[model samples]
Every structure is written in C-alpha cells, then in structure tokens.
Target: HILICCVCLGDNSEDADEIIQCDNCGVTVHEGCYGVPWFCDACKNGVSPSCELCPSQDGIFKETDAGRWVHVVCALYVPGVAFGDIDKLRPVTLTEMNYSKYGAKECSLCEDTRFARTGVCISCDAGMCRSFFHVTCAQREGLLSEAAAEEDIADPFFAYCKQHADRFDRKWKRKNYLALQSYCK
Candidate 1:
C-alpha cells in the first residue's frame, strides 16, 4: 500500500525527507504538502510526536528544550550541537573494547552499546571532567571537521574533545603561564 500526503494528495513513496507521519493516526504525508495546523489531519489532535527522524519508537530519546524529541542515536548526529567556540574541539575514541574484543563499546553521546566505527572523546583532564562524546557525534554537533578531514591525519594543536573544546582556552593560557614562569626561573 502506498501512502499519500493528505494535504496535497501527492505520492511520496520514495521521498523520505519530505515524508512526515502523524504520531497518533499513523498517517503519512509530505511536509511540503502539509499546510498550517499540520498536526495529524487524520487524528485531528495536537498531541502528537512530530519527529520525522524516528519513524519507529523502539529506542530511547531525549526531549529538547524546544519541545522536540530526538532519539539518542539521532541526537548524536543532529545539527546545532555547537553553541559556542568551534576551535577548541577535538575527536576521541572508546578507550577499550567490549567482550567481543572487536572494539565494541557504548557511545558516550547516544549511550548506545555498539561497535566503535565512530570515535569518542573526553575532556583534557582539567576542570571539565566526566565529559565524553562520540567523534561523529561531536562532528555533527559542530565540534570537529565539517570538511571531513581524514582521521589518520594528525592535528595536535586543535585536537580536543567536546569537553575540552570549552576548556581549551583556559588550559592553553595556564600552560603558557606555567612555561613562562619556568623560563624566567
């Protein structure tokens, strides 16, 4: 059975980006076709999840401050991850492997246990402690290479995790001060 947008009554069998389904009525429609009061036209109710990213509710999700809910997995890759400085960020990977010894581990961002295809990060062991994030998650969050730089390449100066991204400024200043003090002595 093919689902059509109720507003425009247009077929969107192949377009997932434009397709949005009502949380209550299970009816699907193209976002381009839907109009004002785009709530569930079939349910006629305003109380419905509007997240088009997750078609199925089989996993845990976090509700944003904007009244939007995002799956933890999806949130790991959602845009707007960065709120401030971009240069202080760095990438990291899971420190250890799971029982399979295949480097399987939980994503610090999504908290999902899976293979570590993407890397993770932590603070530079400064005031910003207990901060962990996946590298891809960090990238999605504007923490790292929007240009898709090769991971094998080294970038020591700018390489920092999300937690460190914020603290790098402080740390950098402190390190320079300490070096100057030693040099004066």
Candidate 2:
C-alpha cells in the first residue's frame, strides 16, 4: 500500500525514516506536517483541550491572558498577539491581542483548509493594505521577512504583501543600517 500523510494527505514512497506511522492507529504522516510528531490525529486523543487560537492542540503551547491555551506558533503568526516574555516565548499574552478586523478576513492567497484550521492568517503590515495571508502562503509569494533565518528566536517579525514589499524593503534596510553601522565603528 502507498503510504499517505494523514494530515497533508500526500502519498509517499519514501524510506522508513522519512515517513512516520502512528503506533496507535497505523496511519502514516509527514514528519513536518503532522502537528504532534509522535501521534496521529485520532491516536492523539490523549491530547489536552483545544487551543484558544486554533483548533489544534499540538506544537508548543502556552497560557493566554484569559487563562486559555494557545499554540506558540498561533500567537506568533496571529496579527495582533504577542508573548509575555519574548526571550522565553512563554505565556502567549492577550493583553495587546485584538481580532476586530483580520479575524473576519479571508486569506488572500492559498485556500488550504488544513492549514487554515491550524495557523491563523496574518495581515499585511502596510497601513492601508488589505492583504491577508498565512506565513507559508506569504513565503510562496516572497513576502515573509525575518532578520535571522536560523536563530532560535525572532523579534520584530513582519510580512508584507506584494504591493508593499519593495517599499518596506527599502525603508527597512535604511532603518537597520542606521543601527548596525555604529556596531562596526
């Protein structure tokens, strides 16, 4: 039988190490796409309650301002949410969180419901821009921005839409240049 990723739903013919099969139910899944690395969806019934930000209960979880739970990635990618302690990345705080507009907006890019169910769509950072998209969707369009690619932590994360990327890129570099130039001297 062709092995299939239960979450991404893609069939694979790769080697044993490349594919992970659930020990409980025998379903196959990708090592990355499967939220809970060890267990398949049904098999992960041992999981705790749902996340306040998304329906998923996998990945790194933290408590919210309201005492609910949310995935770290959810708080990171959500438009207006932030962590209480950026260094430790704990307690996904809701003090500054608000979803008045972007919550009702649809992704301007991919319509993958599976992803839509997990990661929240973050909006373009441009003041008047109306674009709404997920981080991966923004990645496909070259809109995701990060200062350090391999760093364990990132602050001041931003992703702008196509119309705003270049303009932001110019101003963004100028802003960073002014700060780092002093370090070399």
Candidate 3:
C-alpha cells in the first residue's frame, strides 16, 4: 500500500493517479508537472532543506508525506553520513518575476536559446534565461557594446560576432559597405 500525500490526502486516490514518476527515481508527479526530488526521507533517502526553497515548480523534495521524489544527491545529503551546507550552493531561479522586458531582442549577435546558470541581460529588463554571462563575457562576445563614442577604437561587439568580425570591420571601414556589396558592378 503506497502512502498518500498529506497535503492533498492523495493515496493511490484519483489525485495521486495523476502524479508521474520521476525520471531519475520511481517517484511520481502530475503530467506536465515537474516532479519533486528523486526519493523520500522515509524511504531512507534524506532530503535537503535547501531544495524546499527553490523557486522552480518542483524544486521541493518531499517523499515522506506524499511527493516521494527529490534529487538523488539532495536526499543523500540530508541524513546520510555527509551533512553539509547546501544553502551555500543554492542556484538562482529565473521566473516571470524576472524576464526580458528590454523589448524584442534587437541584437543579431545574441545566440538563440543560449543559457547560463546564473546572470541577467543588461539590454533586457531583468530578462531571465539559463543563457547568462558575466558583463565582460557578454561585451567580449559582442552581445553588448557601449553607446556610440567618437574615441572608441575597438569594436566591443567584435567578440559577439567573432564569426564575422572581418565582414563587419570591412563594412564599417567602407561606411557604405552595404551599398557596395549590393551593387551589380
């Protein structure tokens, strides 16, 4: 007899029926619903308190009451021989609270769907994505550049478009590189 969830009182009940199993463990969750951690504490799998605070929908790890899923290692860290500070290793969560408000992405240099573990887009309004980079990294990659300045010698966007820096530089040097490249003659 599988234990039911205390929060929802779903023990093999219709509600529990909707839960899907974790990809890492046999724990279950609702369809399209993210699964909690990989295992439960009662199952001898300790849980990380830090996982509870994750903003990700299924970041919480609860198996003893109802949701019997948690990240495998997270569970191991709880009661296992190794007890440490997981709070120090928390990951920053990007949600609706922080998403692109910098208007439609204008830079052709930006990579599509590229994500970083932690960071924010300077050009966008708190836009959130795994695709984050340090300020210097983004500038180096040409994803970011300072506003026009007469004395600015080096192209900041160069690193962003390393693939076509030559083409960009030539066009920039010509000033009319666009019209020149387009003409039949």
Candidate 4:
C-alpha cells in the first residue's frame, strides 16, 4: 500500500525546485515542469485530476544493494552490454547501436565467438571509432564506406561511435558510467 503524501499526492513529489521533465517519455519532469498542463484539466465531481507518470522508482535502483540498483534488464542493455559483459559476449547494447566510429576499423560490432579473433571491441574506445563492426560485419551492417574492402577497414572512423545512447534506462545518472567501469561484473 502506497502512503500517498496528502500534501503532494505524488504531484509535486520531486520538490518544486528540481528539473521537471520525465526522464523517460520526456514528460514534464517535475511538478513545476508540468506547468498548467502537467496534470489533466478534465473535471468531475469528487474527482481530483492528477498528472500522468511514466514509471515509478521507489528504492535506489529497485533495492538497497551494495551498488546502485537498476533493473537487471536495463543494466544488461547498457554499459553491461556496451562493454561486453553479457553471456553472449556482445560488446554492444541496443542503446549503444550506431555506425559512427565503425568506418574503416576491425568491425567493432561483431560479437565474440570463441574461435573468432575476439570480436567486439574490448579495449576502451578502441578501433577507429565506429563502434564494433568487424570489417565484413561493417559491410554487412551498412556501416563501412562502399569502396572500403573488408581487409582495408581496419582504421576508418578512428574511434568507436560515441553517438549511440548506450543505455535504455533514462533515470540512470552520470555516476552509472563510472560504476559500469568499476563494478559491472
């Protein structure tokens, strides 16, 4: 049972001074962010109209664990995936999907296959920058330049594509990045 704060009713729950935009769907983040339109204007007897909320975050990352809590799924898709920490050995996550730094490099997008040359970029920000599209993988994914041959694609973009979103969870704060680097195991 949620003890709704009578003074706010989760309306201005974040305090009036905080940012007011929905970190996910881009709605009014704060009670103040909503302005007059934050809540529905429709009226009815004995009915108190309220604003729409995306998802609710109760405890830190869902629980008070040693590290900041995050949905197991979301963590899997972000630095966990981007940095190649999945059972599949996928170095890239959906949020980190992009073709920016994958021009003429060793196709950073490829996944690990044990027998293969350790596909997926392992080194931090390695390759020419187009993410992890292997030479042939880049061509297959439409990331490499047309004229570039699979063998010649070792140094195209000069870095991994930094433009990708990397994480699906919006509420995840900046500290998450450092945490991913340190304790994402």
Candidate 5:
C-alpha cells in the first residue's frame, strides 16, 4: 500500500516497526524520523497530508499556508524556515526557505555521494560544523532540538549538533520541549 517509501501510510502506523531499515537508500530513508500534519488532532478527519518539505506523512506536522503541511523535525533542522509561534508552534512560515539547504548540501549522515533528488541536508548553525544531515539523520545522531519560552528570550525550536548543544540552555523549560511527545523519543 506504499507508492513512495516505508509503509504504514508514511506516519509510522500500526505495523511500521516490522520494517525499519530500507536497503534502497536512493529512493527511501533507512528509518522514519516520524508525521501527519500536527493539525490532525483538531482537523477531525482520516487524512494525513504529506509534508511540504520532507517526503514523509507520518510525524509531527504543522499546517502551513494553503493546504500545505510542514514537519516539525524539518522545521527544526532545516535552516531559513521558522515556526509562526514558539509555544503553539503552528502554521510554519516558509516563504524564505533556502533551496540550498534542500537540493545542494549532501547529508553527511548517509551515503549521499551521488547526485540526488530527495530533499537534502541541513547544516549546523555554527560556522564550522562541516556537517550536513537530513532531519532523520539528526534524529538518529542525537542532535539537540528544543522549543521553550523562557524569561530571557522566546527560545526557538532550534536543532544544533551535539558539539554546539551547550548553546541551548538547560533552563529553557523541558516541559515545552517534551510537549511534542514523539519528538522526545
């Protein structure tokens, strides 16, 4: 029942765990980063809109302008994209999404030596990270991603490499970050 990548309607459905690794990394991912647009909770329907950015429909998603959906992991990992609100974290803004972050950079976490077509990699914010990886790569590699509204600043949903994780204050309120549910897993 899959036309694209892994099964379970792309959202890590009932029987998803049965198969996690995809030998064909050329067309599909090795594992799900896990989305149905996060709007599904309130939309009231049997529908899972595919992500407007990444090629997955089975993770935490946000409703963007029009009938588009944005994946949370993508919003965090991909540069030049922003969440409309820090707390609510809905209706992503992507007018300025950098294509360079998509088709240009090669994912260091995967064997992406060949010229590719699937949405590409996101780089670390640090000037010399020298590391670019897809959202799934970030998930697998233990990148630090968090969103919290604190006393000093409206902490963003930023995902930084393990080396630069100190930039994210531990005091930023884990409750807000953990609220995303599966994101913590």
Candidate 6:
C-alpha cells in the first residue's frame, strides 16, 4: 500500500506533488510536510537515535494549529490558504527550471509551441505535470501579471493548467475535511 504523509495524509498522486521517505522507518511524508532530513516522528522522538537528519529541499514551510510543520506549497494545494493569501505564501527555489523534463515543445494546456513567449509552472518542474502555459493564456487566467506569478520564470509556480486554479477552492475545501480528520484521529 502507498504510504500517506503523517502530517498532511496526502498520497503521492500526480497532483499531490513530491514526497520524501524516511530512511529509518520508511514511512513517507509529503516533501512539503517536513523540513529536509526525512525525519519521521519516531526518529524525531529518539526512537531512532542513529537516524541522520536530511536537508530540506527548496519550498516554503508553515505550521499547523497543532504546531506541526508543513510546506506552504502543499499548504496551497491542500487547504489552498489555510495559512493566508496565496500571494503571501513564499516558496524558496531549490533549483532552476529543467525544460527537458517535459520532453515536448507544445504547451500542455493548448499544445501551442509557436508562441514567442511561454511559461511553465513551478509545479511542473516539481513533477506535478508536464504542461506549460503561454503568457497570454496565463494572463487570461489572472496568473500572468499577478504578483504571485511575477517570478514565474525563476521561482515558477502554476505548473498545472489554468483550470487547476479555478478548481482549487472547491477541491481544497473538500480535502480539508480529510486533513481535519487527522487531528481527531
């Protein structure tokens, strides 16, 4: 069975984003859930003294009401704003964009590779999708010039299609119930 994050309880699905596995217990965590070093609760609690801490990859970090740490990137997709405004969530870039990962020239959204200007989501580089967006397309979606999309080239976000944004508020609320269940469980 696929292991879910103890923190967010998210699966390693396409839209779920990156996950990191602890070397100690092998339990998985959403990469955004923990700060580097793949530390499982068991390891953090001294159950595994020999476990070495791993370094956090590039991303934003946040805390829950229980004082647990999680990534802001995942936070955005999970509750989509459990912390605050999406524009306020700042993520640190761990690496530059690798265009070759997509392996296709056409945009994943409209399949148009003929444009003079194009962009990809930080999520795509983070392995969320292989799609890219055109500047015009991004503009239409209100992500092209918005402050959140300002650094789209370097610290890219919006790796998924425009539709993903429109659907997030509803999906985040639906998924939020699951996250809350973890608190009681």
Best by TM-score: 5
Task: Encode model 1's per-residue lDDT on 77-178: one tens digit a residue.
Answer: 333332111122211111122112222333455434443233323222335455445433433333332212555433322324555555544353334323
| Model 6, residue 179: C-alpha shift (Å) | 15
Tell me the tens digit of each residue's lDDT in model 5 across 112-167. 45533357566666666776666654554445455434634354544566677553
Question: Highest lDDT: which candidate?
Answer: 2
Question: Distance from true position, residue 39, model 5, in Å?
Answer: 8.0
Task: Score each candidate by Cα lDDT.
Answer: 0.36, 0.52, 0.30, 0.26, 0.46, 0.37
For all predicted structures, in order, the TM-scores are 0.22, 0.42, 0.18, 0.17, 0.50, 0.23
lDDT (tens digit, per residue) of candidate 3 on 49-141: 322211112222443223423332222221221112223232223234233322222333334434222222233212232332332223333
For residues 85-125, what per-residue lDDT tens digits would candidate 2 score against the true structure? Answer: 44353445664335443245456776456545343567788
Error of 2 at 98 (Å): 2.0
Total clashes, candidate 6?
A: 7
Q: What's the C-alpha lDDT at position 77 in model 3? A: 20
Clashes of each: 4, 0, 24, 27, 5, 7
Tens-digit lDDT string for candidate 4 (58-149): 11111112222222222221222232233233222322232232222343444444313322232224334434433222222222221235
Alpha carbon lDDT at 14, candidate 3: 48
Residue-by-residue lDDT tens digits, candidate 6, 46-79: 4422101011222224433343343443333321
lDDT value, residue 106 of candidate 6: 38
Sort every candidate by TM-score, greatest first. Answer: 5, 2, 6, 1, 3, 4
RMSD to native, candidate 5 = 11.3
